Amino acid sequence: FRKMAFPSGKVEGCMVQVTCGTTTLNGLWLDDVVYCPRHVICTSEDMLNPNYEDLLIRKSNHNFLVQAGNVQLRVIGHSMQNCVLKLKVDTANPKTPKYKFVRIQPGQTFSVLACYNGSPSGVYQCAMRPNFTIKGSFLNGSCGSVGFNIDYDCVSFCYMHHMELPTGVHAGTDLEGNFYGPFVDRQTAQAAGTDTTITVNVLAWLYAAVINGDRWFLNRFTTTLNDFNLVAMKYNYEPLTQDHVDILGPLSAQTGIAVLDMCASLKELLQNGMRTILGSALLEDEFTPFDVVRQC
Amino acid sequence: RKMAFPSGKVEGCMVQVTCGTTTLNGLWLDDVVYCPRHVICTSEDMLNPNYEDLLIRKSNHNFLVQAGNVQLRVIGHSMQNCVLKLKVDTANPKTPKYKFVRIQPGQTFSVLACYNGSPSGVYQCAMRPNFTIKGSFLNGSCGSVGFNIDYDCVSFCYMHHMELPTGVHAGTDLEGNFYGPFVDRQTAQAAGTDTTITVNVLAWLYAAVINGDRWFLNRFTTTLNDFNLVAMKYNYEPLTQDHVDILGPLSAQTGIAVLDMCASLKELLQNGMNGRTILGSALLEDEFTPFDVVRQC
Ligand SMILES: Cc1cncc(-n2c(=O)nc(N3Cc4ccccc4C3)n(Cc3cc(F)c(F)c(F)c3)c2=O)c1
Ligand SMILES: Cc1cncc(-n2c(=O)nc(N3Cc4ccccc4C3)n(Cc3cc(F)c(F)c(F)c3)c2=O)c1
Structure with missing residues (x-):
């Protein structure tokens, strides 16, 4: 993919x-x-x-x-x-x-x-x-x-x-010249802060994996936002919000895997590790929900 | 990227x-x-x-x-x-x-x-x-x-x-001849076993070195034959003398001989990555050619 x-x-x-x-x-x-x-x-x-x-x-x-x-x-x-x-x-x-x-x-x-x-x-x-x-x-x-x-x-x-x-x-x-992030256009000591993983994109990419028939990480369990978020914060993953859940809804419908079910999959991957998903050893976070629908 | x-x-x-x-x-x-x-x-x-x-x-x-x-x-x-x-x-x-x-x-x-x-x-x-x-x-x-x-x-x-x-x-190709033994017919045809493109993996390791990544290097060298005997047990394609010649310029730029980079690869295959990364990847990348690396580095 x-x-x-x-x-x-x-x-x-x-x-x-x-x-x-x-x-x-x-x-x-x-x-x-x-x-x-x-x-x-x-x-x-x-x-x-x-x-x-x-x-x-x-x-x-x-x-x-x-x-x-x-x-x-x-x-x-x-x-x-x-x-x-x-x-x-x-x-x-x-x-x-x-x-x-x-x-x-x-x-x-x-x-x-x-x-x-x-x-x-x-x-x-x-x-x-x-x-x-x-x-x-x-x-x-x-x-x-x-x-x-x-x-x-x-x-x-x-x-x-x-x-x-x-x-x-x-x-x-942006094209109106406003910076993204706390950076300035001068040769001084600047650094990116701690990066986090984009949770809703990882989940989107799991949906793409299931769509492509990579189904091994599915399980019978489900989670809560709060229990998941507790796990999310533990691993430098962005908080998952209701807006996020709602956005994944179209992939929730098309696979039978609701987001807190898929969140239980992601929860387990954070803890136990993985083997491959879509030919990757890392959980990929640069495909949006929209992107997975466009390409899938 | x-x-x-x-x-x-x-x-x-x-x-x-x-x-x-x-x-x-x-x-x-x-x-x-x-x-x-x-x-x-x-x-x-x-x-x-x-x-x-x-x-x-x-x-x-x-x-x-x-x-x-x-x-x-x-x-x-x-x-x-x-x-x-x-x-x-x-x-x-x-x-x-x-x-x-x-x-x-x-x-x-x-x-x-x-x-x-x-x-x-x-x-x-x-x-x-x-x-x-x-x-x-x-x-x-x-x-x-x-x-x-x-x-x-x-x-x-x-x-x-x-x-x-x-x-x-x-x-x-654009003259209408198929890559491989495939036909434009619904038949039981299947792709053969995919192998890794060794010469490309080497190229990408030379790229990692030029971007200042050396952690995977070792003190060893290898013969061509010993390299291939080993790499093929991981389904890597054979490296030919042509491949070695092709990697020559990247060898010169970094100061690392092809067979030393080969030894390094053998070690990576044995060890895996131990939780670390090479140019942002936890797998060995095989879709950059010697040309692509020289061109962009
Ligand atoms: C490997 C790489 C990847 N992305 C961007 C750059 N990059 C570049 O190509 N050229 C810069 N220049 C030219 C110039 C000519 C006259 C006066 C100043 C400069 C700096 N810079 C540095 C740079 C850019 C800034 F916006 C800035 F505020 C600063 F302090 C330094 C590149 O980073 C390099
Ligand atoms: C997921 C995917 C990715 N790449 C290509 C295809 N693909 C496709 O889009 N359409 C095909 N069709 C329509 C049609 C209309 C009239 C007559 C025959 C066909 C088959 N095929 C199947 C296909 C293509 C061949 F070239 C071939 F020789 C064969 F037997 C079957 C697609 O693969 C599918």
Whole structure:
């Protein structure tokens, strides 16, 4: 049962390169605006303690170079919204998909188009971890790469990539430049807090295992939310809420395994351990309930 | 992380093909649509299809090709092995630079899973040694294609034909020749024993080292023959001298000789992981090639 990203085509045609002095990274071109990390206005020197207000006031249109493929776009306007730089350009993107900017919640999944020098290099499927980091595969030069979900023909942009934290995980904002998690866009000592496991996604993935005929961990027992939560907290698993239960309801119906029955399965796996489920030795938590229905 | 190639160049080629009551996906390149030839069958015909007999009874107007909203007009058709080629009157304007390649077991590629000619998702997989792929495919996915994109050229290597009893997948190159000994007929055919792709596992261990993971290394070396005698008792594929040569550059970059990495693998197979992890995995990963690792590292 595979991690599956959305087809990236609608986003590929919006990626550009943005250079400011000696700093280059990626930008998103929608209509006549290009969106990118505001830190592109900084030298490495500046990043120690940047004053973005001042750094921007001292800049103007001619300090920015935007390349769409080989064609240079001329910048005719610059502004900052939170941690995102918005450059107005002379040409509107004729490949602009229908889109919107949404902010996602921890535990939600999305696709990422890793790019280098404005060139798309690959796509993969992630989740917003409970500690507001993402376990992505960004290399140097990936800053400004976006994350998205597609619904019919409408792209929902939810992530812009800003940085790697010391532990190898990533940190970013929404497209309005609001960070996910307690991070700042300056070269200072920052760390992700203790991560937890996304309980409702694990349960979703057990449903997928049963659907695929992997049934060994089912048992005759059931649980309570409180007894389960006591176990959940013991193992660094997110609290399971009624909202969660309700959301799994469609998979509860389609397999005959109610959530507190499935919770009793998960309870036992936490304690005793496992052998394999869907070809995995670890309990997987980056598929949502919605994701399991889409793919199953 | 297993990354797929950006799918947009292929998305622009996907269409819906219908013949009578049967509908699957096709691939619109220039003025041709490629698709599985069993589009011309009913479920009844699938036990013992005579494709030559079924095809000669068809005319151009029997094939409904649909490109999003637009009906393409079929003006010719021929069969090449297990692929049907439908000549249409419009060249696909979104045709990318492309070629058709046939791949070998161990090679990776991206799949664009499509339904009714509509792309729904993209994933990365590999040709298993038993010539199946472990894909993610529902009913209606036939005609979905696998590809690599090496510098702006799309190399098509797979077209999806069928699911086998174990839930693995069988299909052709874009000249319509099947990977492995499978046939496009409902028969008792089954995937042989799946083995692990040793040379890929080694590649991924070299990746772990380059990302600063060394805990699984040991002080030992091995001969090639002793390595293979041992690995095959865990259903690992044999490592050939070619594999060893192929790993040469990763050997040089890290400073760890191939046979030392081999010794390390033997130890991992004996010990398991003792509750720890390698590039985030509690299993040994075999779906990254030497090329994929060099490319992304
Ligand atoms: C392996 C990896 C994975 N994801 C992201 C990065 N990453 C990167 O590619 N480039 C950065 N740069 C360039 C530059 C040019 C001029 C001035 C400053 C910088 C920093 N950074 C570091 C970075 C990003 C921030 F947003 C930030 F606030 C900070 F302090 C450092 C990468 O992390 C690296
Ligand atoms: C879960 C899954 C994953 N990948 C592929 C399939 N798959 C499918 O979607 N449809 C098939 N059909 C419809 C039809 C309409 C008219 C005539 C015949 C068929 C069979 N088949 C079965 C199949 C495909 C072959 F190529 C083949 F040679 C065979 F005998 C059976 C699917 O496997 C299923």
